[PDB]
Every structure is written in C-alpha cells, then in structure tokens.
Amino acid sequence: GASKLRAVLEKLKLSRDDISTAAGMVKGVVDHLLLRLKCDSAFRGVGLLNTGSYYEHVKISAPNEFDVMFKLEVPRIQLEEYSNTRAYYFVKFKENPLSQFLEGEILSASKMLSKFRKIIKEEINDIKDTDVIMKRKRGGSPAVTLLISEKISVDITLALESKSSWPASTQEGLRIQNWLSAKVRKQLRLKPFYLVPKHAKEQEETWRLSFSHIEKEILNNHGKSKTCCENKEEKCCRKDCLKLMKYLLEQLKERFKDKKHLDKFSSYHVKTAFFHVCTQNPQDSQWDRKDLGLCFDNCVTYFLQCLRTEKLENYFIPEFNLFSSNLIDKRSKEFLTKQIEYERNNEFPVFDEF
Ligand SMILES: CCCc1cc(=O)n2nc(NCc3ccc(-c4ccccc4)cc3F)nc2[nH]1
Numbered sequence: 001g002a003s004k005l006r007a008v009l010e011k012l013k014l015s016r017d018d019i020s021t022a023a024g025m026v027k028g029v030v031d032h033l034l035l036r037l038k039c040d041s042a043f044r045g046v047g048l049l050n051t052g053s054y055y056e057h058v059k060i061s062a063p064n065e066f067d068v069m070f071k072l073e074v075p076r077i078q079l080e081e082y083s084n085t086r087a088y089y090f091v092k093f094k095e096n097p098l099s100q101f102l103e104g105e106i107l108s109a110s111k112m113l114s115k116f117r118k119i120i121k122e123e124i125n126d127i128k129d130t131d132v133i134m135k136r137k138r139g140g141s142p143a144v145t146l147l148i149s150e151k152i153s154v155d156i157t158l159a160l161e162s163k164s165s166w167p168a169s170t171q172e173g174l175r176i177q178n179w180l181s182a183k184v185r186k187q188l189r190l191k192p193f194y195l196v197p198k199h200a201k202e203q204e205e206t207w208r209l210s211f212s213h214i215e216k217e218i219l220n221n222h223g224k225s226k227t228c229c230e231n232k233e234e235k236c237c238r239k240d241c242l243k244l245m246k247y248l249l250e251q252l253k254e255r256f257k258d259k260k261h262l263d264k265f266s267s268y269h270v271k272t273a274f275f276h277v278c279t280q281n282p283q284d285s286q287w288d289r290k291d292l293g294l295c296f297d298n299c300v301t302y303f304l305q306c307l308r309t310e311k312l313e314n315y316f317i318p319e320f321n322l323f324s325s326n327l328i329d330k331r332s333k334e335f336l337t338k339q340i341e342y343e344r345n346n347e348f349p350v351f352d353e354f
C-alpha cells in the first residue's frame with residue numbers, strides 16, 4: 001500500500017517545484033507593502049515572519065494560493081487571559097507607536113487592522129503595472145487577501161511578536177522531551193511567541209497565540225537522531241505522513257465544499273494529531289521510510305480516535321481541546337469519521353480524485 005502513497009507524494013512535489021513566475025509576482029508586491037508599511041510610525045517594525053521565505057502554502061493542493069505573515073514586535077508587553085480560554089488574550093502595555101490603537105488599557109485589533117488594511121489598500125493601487133485587487137469582508141486573521149493578476153491570491157496576516165517567556169498556559173505544552181530532548185525544548189521556549197487577531201466563539205478585542213515558527217523549526221530538525229534524513233540509513237517519513245494527512249483533509253473538504261460538514265476543520269487539527277503521534281513514537285526506528293504505509297495508517301488511526309472521543313489537545317496549550325463539543329459538534333466529527341474510515345478501507349481514492 002505504501003507504493004500508492006509514494007505516488008501521491010511524488011505528484012505533490014512535482015507541482016511544488018515546477019517553474020513559476022508567481023513567487024516573484026508575490027515578492028514584488030509584498031516587498032512594496034513592507035516598504036510603505038514601514039513609513040508609518042505605528043508599523044515601523046513590521047517584517048516577514050521567516051525572512052527569505054514568502055513562499056508558504058497552507059493549501060498544498062493549490063500552489064497558486066500564498067500565505068505570508070507580517071510580524072511586528074511589541075516590547076513592554078503584558079497579557080490578560082480572556083475567559084479562561086487558555087489561548088485568547090488581551091494585550092496591555094507598561095510612548096509606544098501603537099498608542100493610536102488603544103481603547104482604554106487594551107490594544108484594539110479592530111483599529112490596528114483598519115489602518116493596516118488602509119495602508120495596503122492605497123499602496124496596491126500605486127502598483128499599476130499589475131491589477132492587484134484587495135478582497136474585503138471582516139475577519140481578523142488573515143487580515144487581508146490580495147488577488148494578483150488572475151488566480152494568484154495572497155493572504156496577509158499581521159502578528160504581534162513578544163520576546164518574553166511564553167504564557168503560563170504553555171507550561172505543560174511542547175512535550176517533546178523524550179523525542180527532541182529537554183535541551184531542544186529549552187531552546188525553543190526561549191524563542192519569541194506571536195499573537196494574531198482572533199475571536200473565540202465567532203466582539204471582544206482578543207488575540208490568539210501562534211507558534212508557526214516553532215512548528216517549522218521542528219519539521220526541519222525532526223529526528224531523535226541529529227542525522228535523521230541526512231543519509232540513506234537514516235531516512236524517515238515524518239514529513240511524508242504530515243503531508244499526506246494535510247492533503248487528505250484538504251481533498252475531502254474540496255469533495256464536500258458545497259456542504260458545510262468539514263468547514264470547521266483546518267490544517268490545525270491534522271497538524272496537532274501528527275505531533276501527538278511523534279510524541280507517542282519518539283524513535284526514528286518507528287518512522288522508517290519503508291514503513292510509510294503503516295506509519296500513515298497509525299496517524300490516520302490516532303486522528304479517528306481523537307474524533308470519536310472528542311479530544312484533541314493543542315500541542316502547546318494542553319488544556320485547549322480543539323475537538324470540544326462547543327468548538328466542533330458531534331455531527332461534523334461523525335461525518336469526517338465516515339469519510340476517512342471509508343477512504344482507508346478503499347486505499348484512499350480521494351488523492352486521485354482531484
Ligand atoms: C505544531 C502543532 C500545530 C500548531 C502550530 C502552531 O503554530 N500553533 N500555534 C498554536 N497556538 C495555540 C492555539 C492555536 C489555535 C487554536 C485553535 C485552532 C482552531 C480553532 C480554535 C482554536 C488554539 C490554540 F490554543 N497552536 C499551534 N499548533
């Protein structure tokens with residue numbers, strides 16, 4: 001069965017790596033906004049999350065849709081946790097450039113994003129070489145969506161950056177000690193964390209934590225051995241299993257994009273289940289590349305068990321249950337259980353389907 005999966009992976013790589021003018025088109029527009037954004041005192045410190053890497057794709061079944069995050073450092077920062085949600089917070093301070101955005105003691109995501117959209121909206125008309133249209137309609141993150149030419153789309157997200165220790169709700173998260181080491185966990189938790197505009201139970205001016213940089217760093221240094229995937233004897237399939245599970249959710253969502261059943265699920269859920277499995281199976285010997293079909297099945301099985309038991313702890317905030325009844329209702333989880341269980345029983349037709 002691992003042969004059919006490797007074909008799916010090979011076709012995904014082929015569309016990732018093919019020659020495309022799109023990256024320069026996005027980079028051309030993106031570097032314009034960064035220059036213009038910096039002219040404003042409130043956004044003087046804005047910059048790309050991972051500098052050099054604009055080419056981030058949430059959807060791997062659509063290489064035309066891009067996703068860049070603009071970070072903005074906020075020092076002297078102080079957080080208040082909203083409604084015991086463990087993940088949504090108010091931003092308070094201790095002269096700061098974001099003072100035009102306050103409402104009392106609380107930084108207003110509403111006002112900050114409005115100026116953020118305003119600056120971008122003007123700068124993209126000053127680009128008359130290409131027709132760049134700004135998609136509107138409210139939603140905190142992604143703050144804005146641009147359509148460059150036709151069929152090129154960029155989601156721009158603004159994230160606060162804090163160079164302080166992580167919020168107390170992350171104390172028992174990132175449980176990577178027996179997999180990546182306590183030494184690595186110290187190093188990662190020394191890194192900054194980020195805050196993006198988000199509302200629980202989608203209105204309060206709340207921000208949700210984001211550790212995209214931590215996930216990216218782990219994926220590129222991912223074995224218990226330091227030489228994992230550096231030689232022939234130490235080739236693992238951790239990345240392949242994550243790609244296949246992200247692709248499986250996307251394709252099923254496309255299959256039922258006219259329904260509403262999978263609208264509540266996102267890459268967050270499959271990414272979270274995968275990292276839990278890596279914590280369960282910390283040995284490189286449990287992710288051998290020849291065992292790709294068995295390892296992918298184990299990842300699928302864990303996700304189904306999460307669906308049935310309605311328990312998917314956030315990897316960084318263990319008290320946050322992404323599959324709680326309030327967040328996703330039993331009907332949606334039972335539906336996704338039926339589709340995934342069907343797919344596995346028939347060697348996953350959905351990968352071929354779209
Ligand atoms: C490495 C594992 C995947 C991962 C990457 C990453 O970058 N992050 N960043 C946070 N931040 C905390 C957090 C984020 C989203 C939600 C959420 C999501 C949907 C609905 C409601 C709530 C809840 C939360 F507690 N979690 C993660 N997981």
Ligand SMILES: [Zn+2]
Pocket residue numbers: 222223228229234235236237238
């Ligand atoms: Zn590896």
